[PDB]
Design a protein around this ligand. Structure first.
Ligand SMILES: [Cu+2]
Ligand SMILES: [Cu+2]
Ligand SMILES: [Cu+2]
Ligand SMILES: [Cu+2]
Ligand SMILES: [Cu+2]
Ligand SMILES: [Cu+2]
Lengths: 302, 302, 302
């Protein structure tokens, strides 16, 4: 009946420890859905619907072949039901039916992680687009039996497009705007739920010489990302999050509800900024993050 | 001088029989273009321009090296000329020049299927975007000499974006809207020409344990699909319809005027819904289909 | 120390000579940024911001391991600063910081081309989107140590979306429109800076039987291209400009700020038109180019 393991799920930029076991296990994951008002941008508030308090949800890391047992709780203060659809799960709605949880209630269910990959998980309660648009999406990494190559640093990044009634910058609590959502005209396109979530004081950090791996998800609802890191090149790209590996790519497409894994070695100090290369989203809508690399200067490289 | 064979072209969800011959042949295909009003959605009618009566056109299945002889007929009642551009054909407009057919006339021409792959074919009469937008696109599968691996079930799925004058839901006969087409703002995004074409009573059917292959095309005119099947994972993906094969992909990009071949084994009963994961298209514009899988329950999977 | 070779850069359709050396070198490149008014379309003028007088900039061709020394000059008549971010360069802004050049000034800096590939380079002065949108982008091809396979013809093609205040066709000098840029609603989508740049008398030329390679870039700012050549099929596609090679692809995605290398043999005479298969961009917004192939007819093909 498999060894029991309490999963270590991480809040985002952080990734759980690499899997140091070579046998299947039942991994217990606890998830709670809570609705809360937070800052989208300076002076701009939004009513986010979250998985564990923020956007994206906590990253789950398991091994191919594991049984994932989820204890799904919908906070008592929630105003609507919530559930979870794991793209990593095979079967009815990816777990949506089994995890339909009204406020103040807890659901439990398990699924076997049959295939390795970087999968998006999100709420699938009607209206599906609204539950996703309000921030209910995260990533679950299903490692191959053999595991992934060691890397110096790992980051959890999820892009998403938000639809605000007021336009970008309008002060105050901004409601979700269904019409802009349907027309695919977001006001904010950000990494990890807020403008600046991965910038300024919250910038990611690495040291010169380190090999960096970024687990990049795209919660959508609607946009497709042309992911790029200014100042660097992708040594490796797990195309669309699958087994296929591309090399020397400057910018990759991350499908809606899809992902990608990028790896690059940062050999020289400086500030590298992650962006959706559909450029105006980055410099006008918030799809901008920073990777600060400390260390010492090599004039030969630049 | 090559044996002559009358091809079997199927209406959509269905795929023609796998090629059971290991020698080149001249495959005779008969195509007719007919304009007709049909139901886009409940109470919503649209004037479709079709290849053989519906959207998409009939799927053609040939073998690499075959000579495809097309007898192209434009129905007497058509109001405009029609032709066909096969992405599988090498040469002037992919056959567009040779197949320019006025109403009540018949054209004939042949081309050699030089390269294996899943190719889109569509009308290319000016204005090209309008002819495509009204539904004139289908898929031609060109099998490799050695043929494709046996599979239990095969489905013909083609996504397309439609531009209606009224907004989604507006009752009555809705005219094509050029302005929305140019701005890439469709009202309907559907699989196989109509909302629900592959859902409800028209849902695709398979049995638990069967390996399923879906020939997925994207007629456009403008959108790019983040194809995904809720509840399942792609075991194999012929990237962009070519020779390259990816594995364990949750969601793939299907280029405009492009395709993809996805294969997955359905091991547990239930309802799986195909969607464009640019989510609002699926739950708000119609890009939603269903694969009903009967059989017996495996709790170990979920 | 390394040898010093002056680089041979080319204006677009043309590609520099293949690298005929098997040792590292310091390649001197001279670039000048000049702002000038040119014809976007018949009767339509636009104030382009360019790298060396046109869009795209001159193509640079170097070898993996080379040190690229850039003498960057901002023409005295320019009204704003300009710099360059090479996606091929590893380090601070891809050279943006070191190349920030006010009008009438010259900057110099060097970087080591560590990785092979087809890279986009563009201006990164605030506001970044505007500098890119006005035409400041080009390609730098970094050949692998071993070099790329010989081909009969090579073409330099870069797609880009332009945001005009007036709508497509509006006569006169059309100003950049920030609002359309942010909403990702371009008026013109073209290959090589202007409508018709690669068509009519400016059509690309090849002879029947020749193997053709196209270095395709996508300067954006915002669109993603579903690159396709009507009448032909891609024998090889360097996926997203990386090492990975796909085959028998009808249409590939070229990411914003990304690229692709496509190779195909043109075996039969005729006119082949390159397009963004998000069709309305091609036939309504200008994303249309032509490849005129000379030679002699083969009815066995079509
Ligand atoms: Cu929810
Ligand atoms: Cu860039
Ligand atoms: Cu999903
Ligand atoms: Cu037509
Ligand atoms: Cu086409
Ligand atoms: Cu500039």
């Amino acid at each position: 009946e498999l060894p029991v393991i309490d999963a270590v799920t991480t809040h985002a930029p952080e990734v759980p420890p690499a899997i140091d076991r070579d046998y299947p296990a039942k991994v217990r994951v606890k998830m709670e859905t809570v609705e809360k008002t937070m800052k989208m941008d300076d002076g701009v508030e939004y009513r986010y619907w979250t998985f564990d308090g923020d956007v994206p949800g906590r990253m789950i890391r398991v091994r191919e072949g594991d049984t994932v047992e989820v204890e799904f709780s919908n906070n008592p203060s929630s105003t609507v039901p919530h559930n979870v659809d794991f793209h990593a799960a095979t079967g009815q709605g990816g777990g949506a039916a089994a995890t339909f949880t009204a406020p103040g209630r807890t659901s439990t269910f398990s699924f076997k992680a049959l295939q390795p990959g970087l999968y998006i998980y999100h709420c699938a309660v009607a209206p599906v687009g609204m539950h996703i648009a309000n921030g209910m999406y995260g990533l679950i990494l299903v490692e191959p039996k053999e595991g992934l190559p060691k890397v110096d640093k790992e980051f959890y990044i999820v892009q998403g497009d938000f639809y605000t009634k007021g336009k970008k910058g309008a002060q105050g609590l901004q409601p979700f705007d269904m019409d802009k959502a349907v027309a695919e005209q977001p006001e904010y396109v950000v990494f990890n739920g807020h403008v600046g979530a991965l910038t300024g004081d919250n910038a990611l950090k690495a040291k010169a010489g380190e090999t960096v791996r970024m687990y990049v998800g795209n919660g959508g609802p609607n946009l497709v990302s042309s992911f790029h890191v200014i100042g660097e090149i992708f040594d490796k790209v797990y195309v669309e999050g699958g087994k296929l590996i591309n090399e020397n790519v400057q910018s990759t497409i991350v499908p809606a509800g899809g992902s990608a894994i990028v790896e690059f070695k940062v050999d020289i100090p400086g500030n590298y900024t992650l962006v959706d290369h559909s450029i105006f989203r980055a410099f006008n809508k918030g799809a901008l993050g920073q990777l600060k690399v400390e260390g010492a200067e090599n004039p030969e490289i630049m």
